[PDB]
Amino acid sequence: GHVETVLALLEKEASQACMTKKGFTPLHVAAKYGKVRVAELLLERDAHPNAAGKNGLTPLHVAVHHNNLDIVKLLLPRGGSPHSPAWNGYTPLHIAAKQNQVEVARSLLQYGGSANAESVQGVTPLHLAAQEGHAEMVALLLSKQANGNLGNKSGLTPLHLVAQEGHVPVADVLIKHGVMVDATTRMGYTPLHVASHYGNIKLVKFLLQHQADVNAKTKLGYSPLHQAAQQGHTDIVTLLLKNGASPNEVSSDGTTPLAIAKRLGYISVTDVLKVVTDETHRMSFPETVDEIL
Amino acid sequence: PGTHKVYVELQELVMDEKNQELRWMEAARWVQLEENLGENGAWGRPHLSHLTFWSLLELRRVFTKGTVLLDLQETSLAGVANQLLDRFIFEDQIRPQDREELLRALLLKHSHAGELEALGGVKPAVLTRSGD
Amino acid sequence: PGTHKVYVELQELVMDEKNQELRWMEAARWVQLEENLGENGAWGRPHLSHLTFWSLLELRRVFTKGTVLLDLQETSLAGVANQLLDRFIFEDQIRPQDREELLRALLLKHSHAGELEALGGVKPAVLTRSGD
């Protein structure tokens, strides 16, 4: 952050287009380290706000990633684009939504950031905000035209990610917005399926209170009760049975929830499903998002 | 300067059918001759630009009281939008309460014909007091 | 994480023999099976929990008009007792005069089986208008 040194070196022909091995111009370094005066001087004397390397990171990406509000508020008027995609397609509002930077996102949105912008795998900033459990961030984006019914390449909705991680307040905002409770992925998994799979019972209770299909079946015929039993969650087995879960239902693989139980030897899940199940090697896994920056 | 043919592009503030989000989409482009963009995303045959009477009437009406920024020293659309909105407010063209919604809109994504297939299409839209 | 298993401990307000001061001491514990604490000081054999008809009668009766505090953000037993007594007064469960001897009874020393050999014994006790 040596403003006078920057002014001298520049007056002597220093090139601000020289990128390090990582790909950072001197405006990238100022954005990373929050040097607002150096960034001010370097933008005034001609520095492309939207300069990027092989990774595609712009000075706004680094400013948002390192949470420099002043650098973002200086880059946006002069040209730092809210719509610049990284290598994985992440825009600067995807990083803001993932990291719960509410103010940086109100600035990134006031300059035209799209909340329904998609990564290479279809992930929107709403997906990242819902997955990370930022209810306030999800509400800002839902008021700037974010679609909560939009799905990624695998069909996963923000409600599906909420089910994967288990944030009740985010699911409350999503359900109040009008998000479909029983949205299905490519293979037919509902948010209730994902919540039963990952052992998030408070969200299972929430979805069942908001009219989720307890006996919903995937394309392979797996119920939210077959997932809870294949993952060993005995309390989701209970709460699902008590909310209408139907045992003796057979998937396309030919396995009922009590055998998936016995097959992986869950004594408690088998002990509870043994009482309700009458007398008579494939594992179901919901789709997941592997995106990371 | 100029005197040589120029590239003019017209863009309309529209909604997407995928997410129903306001965005900007090219409607026409002019290299001495107009081509229009179809719903399928294919530019049509070039033609001489014919105008409607109402369009020229209202263009004269808005140009007579228009807000002009000559020799403006900005190189980005964000700075141009900020200065144009400031001058709109100064000249009592728009109210100061309209500035936030107007800048965001003006700074929304300016998509083109290549992106039209990825979206579900383009339908007309009107900006509301929020930005919905 | 959303629901854990539960270890239950039952404690009764009893009189110790040596000092005649009323104190809380555990009587039975539930870890998937009930174990009772005898007079000698050793926990008995685990057994299935059989209930009397009158106990379930009275449990239903007191639960129907019972006071529940769900998701109460407090960490100490004294504060929990204060909040419970305030809600008891709010719900007309107890009169305000009863609050100071129910508080004084609630923060008595909670003893366990290890103190039975040190103490003379335990005898059933009732709480009088004063913490007597």
Structure write-up:
Chain A has 293 residues and is mainly α. Chain A is built from 17 helices and no strands. Chain A has helices at 3-11, 26-33, 36-44, 59-65, 69-78, 92-98, 102-110, 125-131, 135-142, 158-165, 168-177, 191-198, 201-209, 224-231, 234-241, 257-264, 267-276. Chain A is elongated. Chain A starts with a helix and ends in a 17-residue tail after the last helix. In chain B, a hairpin with a 2-residue loop joins β2 and β3 (34-36). The radius of gyration of chain B is 17 Å and the shape is globular. Chain B has three helices and five strands, in the order βββαααββ. In chain B, strands 1, 2, 3, 4 and 5 form a five-stranded mixed beta sheet that branches. Chains in contact: A-B, A-C. Chains B, C: Belongs to the anion exchanger (TC 2.A.31) family. Chains B, C: It is found in: Cell membrane; Basolateral cell membrane.
The gross shape of chain A turns out to be elongated
The helix-strand sequence of chain A is HHHHHHHHHHHHHHHHH
Q: How many β-strand runs of chain A?
A: 0
Q: What is the radius of gyration of chain B?
A: 17 Å
Question: Termini of chain A, distance in Å?
Answer: 27 Å
Question: Structural class, judged by helices and strands of chain B?
Answer: alpha+beta
Number of strands of chain B: 5
Helices and strands of chain B, in N-to-C order? EEEHHHEE
How many helices of chain A? The count is 17
Q: What is the helix fraction of residues of chain A, given as a range?
A: 40-55%
Q: State the secondary-structure class of chain A.
A: mainly alpha
Organism (chains B, C): Homo sapiens
Protein name (chains B, C): Band 3 anion transport protein
Subcellular location (chains B, C): Cell membrane; Basolateral cell membrane
Family (chains B, C): Belongs to the anion exchanger (TC 2.A.31) family.
